[PDB]
Amino acid sequence: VFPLPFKIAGLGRYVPADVVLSSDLEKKYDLPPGWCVEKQGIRERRWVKDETASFMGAEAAKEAVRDAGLKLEDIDLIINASGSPEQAVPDGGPLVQRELGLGRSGVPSITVNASCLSFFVALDVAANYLNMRRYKRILIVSSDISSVALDFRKPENFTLFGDAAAAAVVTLPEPGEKSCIHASQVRTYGYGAEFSMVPGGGSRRHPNGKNTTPEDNYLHMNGAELLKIGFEYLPRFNEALWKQCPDITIKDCRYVIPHQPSRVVLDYLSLTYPDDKLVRIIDRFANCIGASMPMALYEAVKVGGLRRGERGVLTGTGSGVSFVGMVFTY
Amino acid sequence: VFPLPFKIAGLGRYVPADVVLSSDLEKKYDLPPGWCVEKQGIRERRWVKDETASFMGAEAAKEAVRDAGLKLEDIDLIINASGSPEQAVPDGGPLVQRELGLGRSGVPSITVNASCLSFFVALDVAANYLNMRRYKRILIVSSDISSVALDFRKPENFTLFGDAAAAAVVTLPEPGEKSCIHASQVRTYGYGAEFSMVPGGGSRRHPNGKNTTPEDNYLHMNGAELLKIGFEYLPRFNEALWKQCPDITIKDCRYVIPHQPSRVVLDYLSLTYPDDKLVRIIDRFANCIGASMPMALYEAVKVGGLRRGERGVLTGTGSGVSFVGMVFTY
């Protein structure tokens, strides 16, 4: 079953143009200087002006298509893989297709949703489509605007969140190219759903029904209980991931590329690995929801100089709760 | 690439227990007797009491698991494929996993979202996972509560919508079994997104932002423009679908099994095919959003007596706008 031929052919990014410095936030909202860097690990972030999520997605997608040596007309499947929805109907796939100028193309455009780990799951879905020869040139887009959710009365909130979009074009490798997935795994522990959820925004507590409370549109987070899920299940997760590629270990991999919604995952990794092994984006882009992991993948290649033939590890924990991991040769 | 080995191993359904007769709706809201049957093609529907979407999904999933000769512990991937979300975070996959008693199982639980054609796209995704030997026993759940959206001032609304859940367990076929997919196709025309959309409910018109209007939480439908997309692109869609299986035609298929959000698709089909060829569920279950097509698949097998070795056609048009079609041997 592994290794699976798989090429990340192109990568793209769009971020809002205006830098919001943590120093300016601290000055404006009476926080101690350096508070965001110490507490959040965040020095800057970007917030949209008038952009829509589909707009940012399309901008990133166009870059990734250029990067792959392709034209937009060459893409034969679009997968939206964001952490949050632009609107209720339709899903983000058709919306980004339209924004790209491909609205009359017929190219199938769909959404894969695993909350903030959507991008990962989309890669995995795309890998199987590619190897089954169903589609040849797949665009995966992750675009999120969190700045909409900002609450300027809560520092743990308004200093944490940022906006970004990142995209990938994935294909089969050309003859002689070593690009592949060595291991991939997803596990879900839905008993943890309650420890990171937003109970509003759907049928369960529809505004026009009888199950609404004032707190419906906020993140309900139980940090201690989330870590307990980690304590109990992460060791066996990692064991089973690396068992898929018994001849490849973490020492054979140049970069660890994590979903990074807070500094904690990075701190954990920094105690374990040399700093040059860890791909960091939260420092300049903050928590950008579903765009986090693909932003880090973009960073690994376009700043970190990840070379074809070198190996990486995608890793993350997300609401669900789910755990993902993938070991790949770029 | 085709035919693809593929077995619909088990099917399940849950519908609310209480029948809401069109005759009683007409009596209560001063509509002419027979209006719902004539205008909507709907004689009854089911509306939830206190059920959650995850609850209904789990009930259907359990039936499908029993139907496949399996235990819940045997399922190795869960795909939620509903037309609408239960809540904002997490997605419906972890929620149905939890409801099923599998919250500590680790079984990956994700969502595929193509609006009301989610079930179709999930089948297609599952087919590739199965044939790549990634997973063996995949549960696909489509559960929607629309009765939450009912507006008892608009007859075209409150007489149209119903609640339902349906599920499938899909596997590879056993030796000697002919179960397969002969053809599968998805096309999307995102220029039609505006002709069937709900612009609220996400980042674009977040309640706490500056782009809200009073009509944000309603379906914006342009029926004439939607049909035009059909006129222009459906003939080539059908041509390309059936070209995938040049030796199999519609005469070789026992049932047409459509996504049926209104009577129009059924009327179109009824002018073309004998009535016994068409699988109807809207008459008793109304427009049940993403559950429509899998409800019809359940009906084909569990009422229509679709036999192993006989062939069917899944078909639908959905918000996006997207078109789907699949020709399969059961």
Coordinates of N, CA, C and O in Angstrom, one line a residue, chain A residues 152-214:
Chain A
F152 N -12.2 42.0 20.6 CA -11.2 42.9 21.2 C -11.3 43.2 22.7 O -10.7 44.1 23.2
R153 N -12.1 42.4 23.4 CA -12.2 42.4 24.8 C -11.4 41.2 25.4 O -11.1 41.3 26.6
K154 N -11.1 40.2 24.6 CA -10.3 39.0 25.1 C -8.9 38.9 24.5 O -8.9 38.4 23.3
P155 N -7.9 39.3 25.2 CA -6.5 39.2 24.6 C -6.1 37.8 24.1 O -5.3 37.7 23.1
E156 N -6.5 36.7 24.8 CA -6.2 35.4 24.3 C -6.8 35.1 23.0 O -6.4 34.2 22.2
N157 N -7.9 35.9 22.6 CA -8.5 35.8 21.3 C -7.9 36.7 20.3 O -7.4 36.2 19.2
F158 N -7.9 38.0 20.5 CA -7.6 38.9 19.4 C -6.2 38.9 19.0 O -5.8 39.3 17.8
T159 N -5.3 38.4 19.8 CA -3.9 38.4 19.5 C -3.5 37.0 18.9 O -2.3 36.9 18.5
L160 N -4.4 36.1 18.8 CA -4.1 34.7 18.4 C -4.3 34.5 16.9 O -3.6 33.7 16.3
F161 N -5.3 35.2 16.3 CA -5.9 34.8 15.0 C -5.4 35.7 13.9 O -5.2 36.9 14.1
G162 N -5.2 35.0 12.8 CA -4.8 35.7 11.5 C -5.4 35.1 10.3 O -6.1 34.0 10.4
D163 N -5.3 35.7 9.2 CA -5.9 35.3 7.9 C -4.8 34.9 6.9 O -3.8 35.5 6.9
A164 N -5.1 33.9 6.2 CA -4.2 33.4 5.2 C -4.8 32.4 4.2 O -5.9 31.7 4.6
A165 N -4.2 32.2 3.1 CA -4.6 31.1 2.2 C -3.3 30.5 1.6 O -2.3 31.2 1.3
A166 N -3.4 29.2 1.4 CA -2.3 28.5 0.8 C -2.9 27.4 -0.1 O -3.9 26.9 0.2
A167 N -2.1 27.0 -1.1 CA -2.7 26.0 -2.0 C -1.6 25.1 -2.6 O -0.4 25.5 -2.5
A168 N -2.0 23.9 -3.1 CA -1.1 23.0 -3.7 C -1.7 22.4 -4.9 O -2.9 22.2 -4.9
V169 N -0.9 22.1 -5.9 CA -1.2 21.3 -7.1 C -0.5 20.0 -6.9 O 0.7 20.1 -6.7
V170 N -1.2 18.9 -6.9 CA -0.6 17.6 -6.7 C -0.8 16.7 -8.0 O -1.9 16.8 -8.5
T171 N 0.2 16.0 -8.3 CA 0.2 15.2 -9.5 C 0.9 13.9 -9.3 O 1.6 13.7 -8.2
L172 N 0.9 12.9 -10.2 CA 1.9 11.8 -10.1 C 3.2 12.3 -10.5 O 3.4 13.3 -11.3
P173 N 4.3 11.7 -10.0 CA 5.6 12.1 -10.4 C 6.0 11.7 -11.8 O 5.4 10.8 -12.3
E174 N 6.9 12.4 -12.4 CA 7.5 12.1 -13.7 C 8.4 10.9 -13.5 O 8.9 10.7 -12.5
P175 N 8.6 10.1 -14.6 CA 9.6 9.0 -14.6 C 10.9 9.4 -13.9 O 11.5 10.5 -14.2
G176 N 11.4 8.6 -13.0 CA 12.7 8.8 -12.3 C 12.6 9.7 -11.1 O 13.6 9.8 -10.4
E177 N 11.4 10.4 -10.9 CA 11.3 11.2 -9.7 C 10.9 10.4 -8.5 O 10.0 9.5 -8.6
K178 N 11.5 10.7 -7.4 CA 11.3 9.9 -6.1 C 10.1 10.4 -5.3 O 9.8 9.7 -4.3
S179 N 9.4 11.5 -5.6 CA 8.3 12.0 -4.8 C 7.3 11.0 -4.5 O 6.8 10.3 -5.4
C180 N 7.1 10.8 -3.2 CA 6.1 9.8 -2.7 C 5.7 10.1 -1.3 O 6.3 10.9 -0.6
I181 N 4.6 9.3 -0.9 CA 4.2 9.3 0.5 C 4.6 8.0 1.0 O 4.3 6.9 0.5
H182 N 5.4 8.0 2.1 CA 6.0 6.8 2.8 C 5.0 6.3 3.8 O 4.9 5.1 4.0
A183 N 4.2 7.2 4.4 CA 3.3 6.8 5.5 C 2.2 7.9 5.6 O 2.6 9.1 5.5
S184 N 1.0 7.5 5.9 CA 0.0 8.4 6.1 C -1.0 7.8 7.1 O -1.4 6.6 7.0
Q185 N -1.5 8.6 8.0 CA -2.5 8.1 9.0 C -3.3 9.2 9.6 O -2.9 10.3 9.8
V186 N -4.6 8.8 9.8 CA -5.6 9.7 10.4 C -6.3 8.9 11.5 O -6.7 7.7 11.2
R187 N -6.4 9.4 12.7 CA -7.2 8.8 13.7 C -8.1 9.9 14.4 O -7.6 11.1 14.4
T188 N -9.3 9.5 14.8 CA -10.2 10.4 15.3 C -10.8 9.9 16.7 O -11.1 8.7 16.8
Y189 N -10.8 10.7 17.7 CA -11.3 10.4 19.0 C -12.4 11.4 19.3 O -12.2 12.4 19.9
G190 N -13.6 11.0 18.8 CA -14.8 11.9 18.9 C -15.3 12.1 20.3 O -16.1 12.9 20.5
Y191 N -14.8 11.3 21.3 CA -15.1 11.6 22.6 C -14.6 13.0 23.0 O -15.1 13.6 24.0
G192 N -13.6 13.5 22.3 CA -13.0 14.8 22.5 C -13.8 15.9 21.8 O -13.3 17.1 21.9
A193 N -14.8 15.6 21.1 CA -15.5 16.7 20.3 C -15.9 17.8 21.2 O -15.7 19.0 20.9
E194 N -16.4 17.5 22.4 CA -16.9 18.5 23.4 C -15.8 19.4 23.9 O -16.1 20.5 24.4
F195 N -14.5 19.0 23.8 CA -13.4 19.7 24.4 C -12.8 20.8 23.4 O -11.9 21.5 23.8
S196 N -13.3 20.8 22.2 CA -13.0 21.9 21.2 C -14.1 21.9 20.2 O -14.1 21.2 19.2
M197 N -15.1 22.7 20.4 CA -16.3 22.8 19.6 C -17.0 24.2 19.6 O -16.7 25.0 20.4
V198 N -17.8 24.4 18.6 CA -18.7 25.5 18.5 C -20.1 24.9 18.2 O -20.3 24.4 17.1
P199 N -21.0 25.0 19.2 CA -22.2 24.3 19.1 C -23.3 25.0 18.3 O -24.3 24.3 17.9
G200 N -23.1 26.2 18.0 CA -24.0 27.0 17.1 C -23.6 26.7 15.6 O -22.7 25.9 15.3
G201 N -24.3 27.4 14.7 CA -23.9 27.4 13.3 C -24.4 26.2 12.5 O -24.0 26.0 11.4
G202 N -25.4 25.5 13.0 CA -26.0 24.4 12.3 C -27.4 24.0 12.7 O -28.0 24.8 13.4
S203 N -27.8 22.8 12.4 CA -29.1 22.3 12.8 C -29.3 22.2 14.3 O -30.4 22.4 14.8
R204 N -28.3 21.7 15.0 CA -28.5 21.4 16.5 C -29.0 22.6 17.3 O -29.9 22.4 18.1
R205 N -28.5 23.7 17.1 CA -28.9 24.9 17.8 C -29.2 26.1 16.8 O -28.7 27.2 16.9
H206 N -30.0 25.7 15.8 CA -30.5 26.7 14.8 C -31.2 27.9 15.5 O -32.0 27.6 16.5
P207 N -30.9 29.1 15.1 CA -31.4 30.3 15.8 C -32.9 30.3 15.9 O -33.4 30.8 16.9
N208 N -33.6 29.8 15.0 CA -35.1 29.7 15.0 C -35.7 28.6 15.7 O -36.9 28.3 15.6
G209 N -34.9 27.8 16.5 CA -35.3 26.7 17.3 C -35.2 26.9 18.8 O -35.0 28.0 19.2
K210 N -35.4 25.8 19.5 CA -35.6 25.9 21.0 C -34.4 25.5 21.8 O -34.4 25.5 23.0
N211 N -33.2 25.3 21.2 CA -32.0 24.9 21.8 C -30.9 25.9 21.8 O -29.7 25.5 22.0
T212 N -31.2 27.2 21.6 CA -30.2 28.2 21.6 C -29.8 28.6 23.0 O -30.6 28.7 23.9
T213 N -28.5 28.9 23.2 CA -28.0 29.6 24.4 C -27.1 30.8 23.9 O -26.7 30.8 22.7
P214 N -26.8 31.7 24.8 CA -26.0 32.9 24.5 C -24.5 32.5 24.1 O -23.9 33.3 23.4

